Amino acid sequence: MCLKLNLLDHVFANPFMNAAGVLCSTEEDLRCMTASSSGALVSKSCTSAPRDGNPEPRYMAFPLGSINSMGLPNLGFDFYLKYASDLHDYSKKPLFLSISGLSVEENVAMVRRLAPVAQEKGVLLELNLSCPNVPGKPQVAYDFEAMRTYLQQVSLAYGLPFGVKMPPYFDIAHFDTAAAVLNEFPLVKFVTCVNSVGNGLVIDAESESVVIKPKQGFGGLGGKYILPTALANVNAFYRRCPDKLVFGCGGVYSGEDAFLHILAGASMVQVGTALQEEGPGIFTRLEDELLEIMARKGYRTLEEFRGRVKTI
Amino acid sequence: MCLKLNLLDHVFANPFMNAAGVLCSTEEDLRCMTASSSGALVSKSCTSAPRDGNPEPRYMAFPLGSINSMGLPNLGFDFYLKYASDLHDYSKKPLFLSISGLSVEENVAMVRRLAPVAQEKGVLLELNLSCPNVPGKPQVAYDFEAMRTYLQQVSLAYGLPFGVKMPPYFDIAHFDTAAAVLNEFPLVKFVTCVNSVGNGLVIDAESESVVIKPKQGFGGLGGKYILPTALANVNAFYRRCPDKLVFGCGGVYSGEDAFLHILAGASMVQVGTALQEEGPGIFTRLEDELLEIMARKGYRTLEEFRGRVKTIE
Ligand SMILES: Cc1cc2nc3c(=O)[nH]c(=O)nc-3n(C[C@H](O)[C@H](O)[C@H](O)COP(=O)(O)O)c2cc1C
Ligand SMILES: Cc1cc2nc3c(=O)[nH]c(=O)nc-3n(C[C@H](O)[C@H](O)[C@H](O)COP(=O)(O)O)c2cc1C
Ligand SMILES: O=C1C[C@@H](C(=O)O)NC(=O)N1
Ligand SMILES: O=C1C[C@@H](C(=O)O)NC(=O)N1
Numbered sequence: 001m002c003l004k005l006n007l008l009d010h011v012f013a014n015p016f017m018n019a020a021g022v023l024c025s026t027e028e029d030l031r032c033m034t035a036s037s038s039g040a041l042v043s044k045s046c047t048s049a050p051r052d053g054n055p056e057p058r059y060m061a062f063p064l065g066s067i068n069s070m071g072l073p074n075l076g077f078d079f080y081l082k083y084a085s086d087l088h089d090y091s092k093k094p095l096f097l098s099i100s101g102l103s104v105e106e107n108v109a110m111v112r113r114l115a116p117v118a119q120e121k122g123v124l125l126e127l128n129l130s131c132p133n134v135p136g137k138p139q140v141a142y143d144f145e146a147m148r149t150y151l152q153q154v155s156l157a158y159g160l161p162f163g164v165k166m167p168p169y170f171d172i173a174h175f176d177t178a179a180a181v182l183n184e185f186p187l188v189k190f191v192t193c194v195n196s197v198g199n200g201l202v203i204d205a206e207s208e209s210v211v212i213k214p215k216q217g218f219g220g221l222g223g224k225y226i227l228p229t230a231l232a233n234v235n236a237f238y239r240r241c242p243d244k245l246v247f248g249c250g251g252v253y254s255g256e257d258a259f260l261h262i263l264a265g266a267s268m269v270q271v272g273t274a275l276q277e278e279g280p281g282i283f284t285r286l287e288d289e290l291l292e293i294m295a296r297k298g299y300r301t302l303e304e305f306r307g308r309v310k311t312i
Numbered sequence: 313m314c315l316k317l318n319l320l321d322h323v324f325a326n327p328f329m330n331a332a333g334v335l336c337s338t339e340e341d342l343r344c345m346t347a348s349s350s351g352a353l354v355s356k357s358c359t360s361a362p363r364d365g366n367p368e369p370r371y372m373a374f375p376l377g378s379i380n381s382m383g384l385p386n387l388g389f390d391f392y393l394k395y396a397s398d399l400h401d402y403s404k405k406p407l408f409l410s411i412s413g414l415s416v417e418e419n420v421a422m423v424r425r426l427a428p429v430a431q432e433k434g435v436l437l438e439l440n441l442s443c444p445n446v447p448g449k450p451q452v453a454y455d456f457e458a459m460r461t462y463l464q465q466v467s468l469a470y471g472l473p474f475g476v477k478m479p480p481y482f483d484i485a486h487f488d489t490a491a492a493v494l495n496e497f498p499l500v501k502f503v504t505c506v507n508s509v510g511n512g513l514v515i516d517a518e519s520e521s522v523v524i525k526p527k528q529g530f531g532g533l534g535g536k537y538i539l540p541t542a543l544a545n546v547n548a549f550y551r552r553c554p555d556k557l558v559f560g561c562g563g564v565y566s567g568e569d570a571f572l573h574i575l576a577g578a579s580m581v582q583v584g585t586a587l588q589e590e591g592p593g594i595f596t597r598l599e600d601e602l603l604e605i606m607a608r609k610g611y612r613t614l615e616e617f618r619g620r621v622k623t624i625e
Contacts, residue, residue, distance in 0.1 A: 005519035027430050058625070064376070064536060127484045138485040168482070172530070173450040197372070200484035201544035203572045205605070209622035216623045218484070218544060224376060232513035232530055308387070310521040311528045 001295065003039070003287060005302060006162065007245060007267055008124060008189055010094040014039040014287050016301065017264070019064050019222075019249050019272030020098040020126060020165060021025040021045060023280065025060025025074060030083055034092050036280035037287060041093065043080045044251065045100035045128045045165075048109055050076035052234065054133065059276075060208040065251075067202045069133040069214035072100055077110050084114075084123040095121075098165065100128035100138055104146075104153050106246020113298040118160050125153055130167035132198030132220045139167045139198060141178065148181050155187045163190035165245070166237070167196050175233075179240030192270065193233035223273035227251025231264045238265025238307050255289020265307040270298035313603060313614050317351070319557060319579055320436060320473065320501060322459040323428050327574070327580065327614065331534075331561050331584030332410040332438060332477060335592065337386060342395060346404050348592035349599060352580065355392045357412035357440045360421060362388035366526035371588075372514065375562075377535020378585040381445040381526035384412055389422050396426075407433075410477065414449055416458075416465050423470040430472050435602050439466055442479035444510030444532045451479045451510060453490065460493050467499045474608065475498040475502035475559070478549070480509050480541050491552030500560045502557040504531035504582065505545035505597075508532025511610040535585035539563025550577025550619055557583045567601020578618040592611075 003014035017040040017219040023029050033041035034146075041067040053073025060067055072082075080097055088095050097114065101107035106126065117123055129141040129150060141147045154162070161168040166183065169175055182188055202211045210217025230250025238246045248266030252258055261269050275282050299305055315326035329352040335341050337356040345353035365385025372379055392409055402408050409426065413419035419439065429435060441453040442460060453459045453476075467473070476494065481487055488509075494500055505506040514523045522529025544563025550558045560578030564570055565586040573581050587594050611617050 061476070067540065089622050097422055107480065136561070138483050142486075143484050170444070170449050170480070170482075171454050172511060172527075174454070174510075197541065199484060199487070199544055199548075200540035201547055201576070202540050203543055203575055203621055207622070208575055208617070208620065210624060213624040215484075218548075221540055228379065228512035228514050228533055228537065229509065231515055232511055234468070235513055236511075236530075256517050259517055263515060263520055295430075307522065309515055309529075310519070312522060312525040 001291060001300060003291065003302065008123065012039040012094060015267065016258070016270045016283050016286055017041055017270050018275055019270040020128065020296070022272045022276045025252060027083065027087065032280060033223055037283040039093060039120050040096065042096035042126055043083065044074045045072055045098040045131065046074045046080045047072055047101060048106050050074065057212050058214055060211045061186065062202070065225040065275060066220060066276065067194065067200055067212055067219040067221055069212050069219035071133050072131060081113060081117060084121060084310060085117045085163050090121060091218045092263055095127045096123065096124045098126040098128050099132050102134065104150050107150060108153050115158055115160060123274050126156065126161035126165055126192060127162055128165040130165050130195035132167070132196060133214070135215060141167050144177055144181055148184070149185045151181070151185045151188065155185055158187070161189040163192060164188055165192045165195055166233070167195040168233050175236040175240060179237055182227055182241055184246065188244060190247055190267070191237050191241060192247040192249055193237050194226070194230050194250045196222050197226050217250055219247065222250065224251055224253070227257060230259055234261055235264040235309060255286050255293055258286055258290050261295050262302060262306050263309040267306070313606055315599060315602065315614065317614060321536070322434065324406060324580070326351040327579065327581045327597050329353055329582050330587055331582040332384065332440065337473045339395065340519045340584045342400070346401060346590060349594055350592070351405060352408060354408035354410050354438055355395065356386045357384060357410040357443065358392045359384055359390045359413060360389050360418050362386065368476055368525060372523045373585065373589050374514070376477060377533060377537040378588065379524055379533055380508065381524050381531035382527060383445050384440050386443045387445050393425060394431060396433060396438055397429050399565055400497040402433060406436065406619055408436045408438045410438040410440050412443050414446065415538045416462050416613055419462060420465050420469045423466055425472055436478055437470065437474035438504060439474055440477040442477050442507035444508060445526070446477070448525060453479050456489050456493055457538060459498070463493065463500065470499070472500055475504060476500055477507055478486065478545065480506040480538070481543050484608060487548040491549055494553055494556070500556060503549050503553060504559040504561055505549050506538070506542050507563045508534050509538050509541060509583065511546040514576055534562065536563055536565070539569060543572055546573055546578050547576040547621060567605055570602050571605050574618050575614055575621040579618070621623040
């Protein structure tokens with residue numbers, strides 16, 4: 001039994017990949033992810049120009065997860081485009097390229113240049129509408145009119161299939177509205193749920209201090225804290241976007257957690273915090289653990305249980 | 313060394329109380345909370361008429377916290393009003409009464425009747441604008457115009473100091489807007505951050521099933537899952553509402569967790585999931601643990617460290 005699957009006109013060895021931002025900023029990182037057992041990889045969310053990001057310390061991990069306010073430190077779109085066009089070995093695994101411009105104009109500028117490379121190489125766009133860490137720039141997809149504008153403009157400028165990295169929602173009306181916006185756009189083929197849970201605050205009791213420097217300690221949460229939130233979002237969008245794929249991200253540390261994401265509706269399963277903490281060896285463990293659970297239950301394929309979470 | 317507080321023209325032996333909805337639905341529950349070592353208690357969020365609530369199972373707890381879709385089961389406003397008027401022993405500790413009408417009109421109706429009892433007995437109103445569990449009724453305070461309408465109408469009909477139970481926010485723009493709305497209302501004297509993190513989904517791997525029945529398994533999250541979110545909201549409103557009090561709620565299992573809430577700016581500290589799981593004995597443990605931390609640090613009173621969380625220069 002193997003975990004191999006086909007999606008978006010690509011073949012994947014297994015459903016696992018890094019979450020955008022983790023182990024994917026430099027050529028070294030991307031080569032490392034390519035050499036790993038992951039089924040795919042995605043590059044760091046990029047901007048038109050290189051960015052240093054927010055002041056350090058800006059990432060901290062704990063038993064229950066992580067907090068981060070990286071601030072989109074990246075080598076610039078030129079680099080990630082070059083990686084996609086010239087450097088990536090597509091015979092190894094598919095590549096997603098994540099973009100996170102600070103305005104609709106910036107995103108449009110990037111996708112116009114990405115298009116010919118997508119046409120030639122098959123690199124897949126993930127449009128990030130959910131960065132919670134750039135000062136003065138609220139999560140785009142928490143403003144539904146802004147979200148619609150970004151998707152309209154990117155659809156028109158790109159003209160090719162793409163996906164969207166979504167923020168977590170906490171309100172049924174918001175699930176309804178967000179999914180309806182997404183469903184207006186036929187080029188949106190996948191929806192990644194979720195980005196970090198925005199603007200949490202970790203405080204150290206001994207020092208009586210916040211643990212990260214940017215934004216007075218406020219940063220996005222990942223890891224064990226966010227699994228039920230992530231599952232809810234995966235399932236909410238799986239139910240509301242029956243003609244799109246949903247990729248799960250949030251709180252994956254084990255094959256069992258991945259199994260839950262897939263039950264909720266996930267096609268691909270992304271790994272952030274756990275990968276940052278454990279390193280790329282995690283992918284062989286996750287694959288082994290998922291296959292074991294499948295064998296115990298008598299499942300031979302992912303399709304047998306994807307989206308099949310039972311209600312009472 | 314002491315945990316005493318004096319706020320809202322009441323005296324509290326310590327900052328601890330139940331979170332609304334936990335151990336506070338029946339007369340038995342309220343007497344139990346009164347008999348505990350808590351500094352105060354709050355009654356179950358009530359509606360004009362009694363409610364059975366959502367179908368069971370509707371609460372489940374786990375090592376990292378809880379999920380619930382109770383659906384506002386309650387004995388009705390008449391009962392909680394009678395409790396505040398006739399039954400509560402105010403000599404023991406202060407009482408808060410939580411209301412969660414399903415419309416602005418329902419809340420207005422209740423506060424009109426609560427006002428003379430608040431005036432006579434000193435019961436304190438907590439207006440719940442953040443229930444995430446009634447089908448078809450989104451969290452009021454996620455709609456800022458609705459929030460303003462509720463606060464305007466309740467302020468005018470009630471005319472007395474009250475507080476607001478707020479949902480968690482995750483966006484700096486939302487902290488800014490929500491606090492600005494609250495600051496328009498001088499009768500809002502306290503802000504309780506936070507209600508449960510809405511519409512999470514817990515799935516059991518073995519049975520491949522959601523663990524609660526209502527709303528296809530979607531329910532509010534509490535407990536360890538939500539502590540950093542709760543601290544963020546407490547501190548965000550503490551910073552933005554310098555002329556109000558902030559009450560902390562979310563993820564408190566220990567004196568250390570309470571200490572963090574207080575550093576973030578909390579006056580009172582409410583306990584939900586951990587109280588549901590451990591029972592009212594938790595209050596003596598939290599008091600002992602908080603006093604131990606204070607002793608180790610040389611803090612003599614809560615005011616010496618409330619809101620004093622340090623940021624990195
Ligand atoms: C160090 C750090 C950097 C991240 N950078 C990005 C980013 O560039 N783009 C993005 O869409 N998400 C980014 N994320 C969010 C993750 O992709 C993921 O959505 C989130 O961490 C939740 O998954 P987890 O619980 O596995 O950590 C970052 C997360 C962390 C921990
Ligand atoms: C069983 C259950 C019932 C609740 N009922 C109410 C309610 O009636 N009114 C309210 O404002 N919050 C209610 N809550 C939310 C809690 O007051 C609290 O805000 C939340 O559980 C987070 O705190 P915790 O992490 O200590 O559980 C309820 C929570 C649970 C666990
Ligand atoms: O989309 C993003 C951006 C990233 C960062 O701060 O660079 N951090 C995140 O958690 N999500
Ligand atoms: O405000 C509320 C209401 C309660 C319920 O469902 O009755 N559950 C909650 O988590 N918060």
